[PDB]
């Protein structure tokens, strides 16, 4: 079992917000990240979300998945993962405006793909992949985190058009679209639709197919093959999008 007895986890600095909780930097056999729900008595729904999230996490053991270490229920519902010594991909690209070498950008994309490939093989749909949930350990290793929304089979900039419309909606392919947006961020250094200042309009338009990321903004040394893979991942029609083994193969094919 993976339950941690009450009183063992030290909780330090509040790091930010996750899906259905608050994330802190903590101590439990070294540095850890802890997500907890703060409601005194959790509702059956909340208690469910927690049981589901743990269930998904414990199915994951892979270098590119943020390492699940354990959970606590008293005094509150808490999830414990390894602490990643570094910043989220989002922070790097958009807050700090870190300029990475192209080969390092590709390597990041490769690992993210590597992680996604694993989840999908295990029948996990992340449902919340975005650069906020991708953390760079010691500047080298990529870790995908925050499984609050994952299952086994508010961040609109990564949502596939079908997900926005809600008419069907989550799948391996919607995960792949989110990946495409992460690729975009890597290759452009920007969030999409950054010349549009209205969230509802972006929602309406991506949903209806009127708007899509502008690939002419990719850094000029971004390989043609990579620009092309990005376009494939971003196909409005979900069935036209590649699978992760495919995405992986073509990234690896850039051993050039
Ligand atoms: C409890 N683990 S979790 O549920 O997988 C989780 C959920 C959300 C977040 N963040 C909080 C900040 O906002 C972005 C999302 C994190 N963050 C981190 N986790 C580990 N090492 C880390 N180094 C730097 C960060 Cl950042 C970080 C972890």
DSSP string, the chain: --BPPTT--EEEEEEEEETTEEEEEEESSSEEEEEE---SS--HHHHHHHHHHHHHHTT---TTB--EEEEE-SSS-EEEEEPPSS-BHHIIIIIS-----HHHHHHHHHHHHHHHHHHHHTTEE-S--SGGGEEEETTTEEEE---TT-EE---GGG--HHHHH------HHHHHHHHHHHHHHHHHSS-TTTT---HHHHHHHHHHTS----GGGS-TTS-HHHHHHHHHHT-SSGGGSPPHHHHHHHHHT---
Ligand 1 pocket test target in 2, 56, 127, 135 with most atoms within 8 Å of CB: 135
Beta bridge partners of 79: 35, 71
Which residues line the annotated binding site for ATP?
Answer: 15-23, 35
Specify the ligand 1 atom closest to the Cα of 53. Answer: 4
- Give the resolution value in Å: 3.0
Q: What distance, in Å, lies between the first and last C-alpha atoms of the chain? A: 46
Boundary residue ending a domain (50, 67, 85): 85
Measured in angstroms, how far is the CA atom of residue 133 from the centroid of ligand 1? 7
> If you take atom 3 of ligand 1, which residue's CA is the nearest one?
146
Q: What Rg do the C-alpha atoms of the chain give, in angstroms?
A: 18
- Are 211 and 202 in contact by the 8 Å Cβ rule? The answer is yes
- Whether residues 57 and 101 share a domain: the answer is no
Query: Ligand 1: which residue has its CA nearest to atom 27?
Result: 84
Place of tokens 């229920």: 73
Q: Determine the Cα–Cα distance for residues 52 and 46; give it in Å rounded to an integer.
A: 10
Identify the experimental approach.
X-ray
- Whether the CB-CB separation of 157 and 181 falls below 8 Å is answered with yes
Report residues whose beta carbon is within 6 angstroms of any ligand 1 atom. Answer: 15-16, 18, 23, 33-35, 66, 79, 81, 83-84, 86-88, 132-133, 135, 145-146
Whether 115 and 64 have beta carbons less than 8 Å apart is answered as yes
Cα(210) to centroid(ligand 1), Å: 34
Mutate to test the pocket of ligand 1, among 88, 139, 149 (most ligand atoms within 8 A of CB): 88
Task: Give the residue numbers marked as catalytic.
Answer: 128
The tokens for 102 are 């192209």
8 Å CB contact between 126 and 150: yes
Alpha-carbon distance of 108 to 245, in angstroms, equals 16
Is 95 in the same domain as 38? no
DSSP string, 28-97: SSSEEEEEE---SS--HHHHHHHHHHHHHHTT---TTB--EEEEE-SSS-EEEEEPPSS-BHHIIIIIS-
Q: Tokens 């961040």 identify what position? A: 155
The whole-angstrom separation of Cα 225 and Cα 76 is: 48
Please indicate, yes or no, whether residues 119 and 225 belong to a single structural domain of this protein: yes
User: Which tokens belong to 91?
Assistant: 């922070």
Nearest CA to ligand 1 atom 9: 18
Q: How far is the CA of 75 from the centre of ligand 1 (A)?
A: 21
- Residues 112 and 61 both lie in one domain: no
CATH number at residue 155: 1.10.510.10
The token pair that represents 243 in the structure block? 């699978």
Residue to substitute in 4, 18, 124, 142 for testing ligand 1 pocket (most ligand atoms within 8 angstroms of CB)? 18
Residues 34 and 106 in one domain: no
Cis before residue 75, ω within 30 degrees of 0?
yes
Which of 40, 69, 85 marks a domain boundary? 85
Question: Domain count of the chain?
Answer: 2
The domain that holds 60 is classified in CATH as 3.30.200.20
Given the CA of residue 35, which atom of ligand 1 is nearest to it?
Answer: 1
What residues does 24 pair with on adjacent strands?
Answer: 14, 34
Residue 185 is part of which domain span?
A: 86-256
């Amino acid at each position: 079992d993976w339950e941690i007895p009450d009183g063992q986890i030290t909780v330090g600095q509040r790091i930010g917000s996750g899906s259905f909780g608050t994330v802190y930097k903590g101590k439990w056999h070294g540095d850890v990240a802890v997500k907890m729900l703060n409601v005194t008595a959790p509702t059956p729904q909340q208690l469910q979300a927690f049981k589901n999230e743990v269930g998904v996490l414990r199915k994951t053991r892979h270098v590119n998945i943020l390492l699940f270490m354990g959970y606590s229920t008293k005094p509150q519902l808490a999830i414990v993962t390894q602490w990643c010594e570094g910043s989220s991909l989002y922070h790097h690209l958009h807050t700090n405006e870190t300029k990475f070498e192209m080969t390092k950008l590709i390597d990041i994309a490769r690992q993210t793909a590597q992680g996604m490939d694993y989840l999908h093989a295990k029948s996990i749909i992340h449902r919340d992949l975005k650069s906020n949930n991708i953390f760079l350990h010691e500047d080298l290793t990529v870790k995908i985190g925050d499984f609050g929304l994952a299952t086994v089979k508010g961040s609109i900039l990564w949502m596939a058009p079908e997900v926005i419309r809600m008419q069907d909606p989550y799948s391996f392919q919607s995960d792949v679209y989110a990946f495409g947006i992460v690729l975009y961020e890597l290759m452009t250094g920007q969030l999409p639709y950054s010349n549009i200042n209205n969230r509802d309009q972006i929602i309406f338009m991506v949903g209806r197919g009127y708007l899509s990321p502008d690939l002419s903004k990719v850094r000029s040394n971004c390989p043609k093959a990579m620009k092309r893979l990005m376009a494939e991942c971003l196909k409005k029609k979900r069935d036209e999008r590649p699978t992760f083994p495919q995405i992986l193969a073509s990234i690896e094919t850039l051993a050039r």
